[PDB]
Design a protein around this ligand. Structure first.
Ligand code: HEM
Ligand code: NO2
Ligand code: NO2
Ligand code: NO2
Ligand code: NO2
Length: 152
């Protein structure tokens, strides 16, 4: 797990996201979709987005970005005690949305990139370490639920 000190760093970094949740959420999804176009295909409601300009101009994409990072934020503030919060998301993403765990790796990497891009020089080595650990814990606990469900 993470140390108390590491959790404190995670939640300090998260303060950056909370100041502009829509903007961070939008950039995370754009980074995901542009780096990994196969991920766009999992969203019927974003499939029409044929260019990054269209992605940037999509108010619904920003809306979903807010939904996604709000959910993640709630999970992070549980500091690993997130079974109840994580369970339903693991279940919907495996069973309904059919999201391979690899795509959760992609979006985790996208979050790290967006933090550096929006806050260059203000996302320190210790902070990256802590946030990376938190995202790995999140992914690992989702993966356990995926295995329960036999989802690949
Ligand atoms: C930080 C990781 C993620 C979080 C916190 C997250 C969160 C959410 C939430 C809260 C919802 C709405 C409720 C639900 O259906 O469970 C949702 C819907 C959805 N998610 Fe995710 N998600 C994540 C990663 C991903 C990834 C990587 C993909 C695909 C590559 C994905 C695909 C979808 C799809 C297709 C929906 C349904 C969208 C709609 O039609 O309205 N999710 N997600
Ligand atoms: O504190 N990590 O679960
Ligand atoms: O929990 N202090 O590393
Ligand atoms: O954007 N992930 O639902
Ligand atoms: O209507 N089920 O998303």
């Amino acid at each position: 797990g993470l140390s108390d000190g590491e959790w404190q760093q995670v939640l300090n970094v998260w303060g950056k996201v909370e100041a502009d949740i829509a903007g961070h959420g939008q950039e995370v999804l754009i980074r995901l979709f542009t780096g990994h176009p196969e991920t766009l295909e999992k969203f019927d409601k974003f499939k029409h987005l044929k260019t990054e300009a269209e992605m940037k101009a999509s108010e619904d994409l920003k809306k979903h970005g807010t939904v996604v990072l709000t959910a993640l934020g709630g999970i992070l503030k549980k500091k690993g005690h997130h079974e109840a919060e994580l369970k339903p998301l693991a279940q919907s993403h495996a069973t309904k949305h059919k999201i391979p765990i690899k795509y959760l790796e992609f979006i985790s990497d996208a979050i790290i990139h967006v933090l550096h891009s929006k806050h260059p020089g203000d996302f320190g080595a210790d902070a990256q370490g802590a946030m990376t650990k938190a995202l790995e814990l999140f992914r690992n606990d989702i993966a356990a639920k995926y295995k329960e469900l036999g989802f690949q």
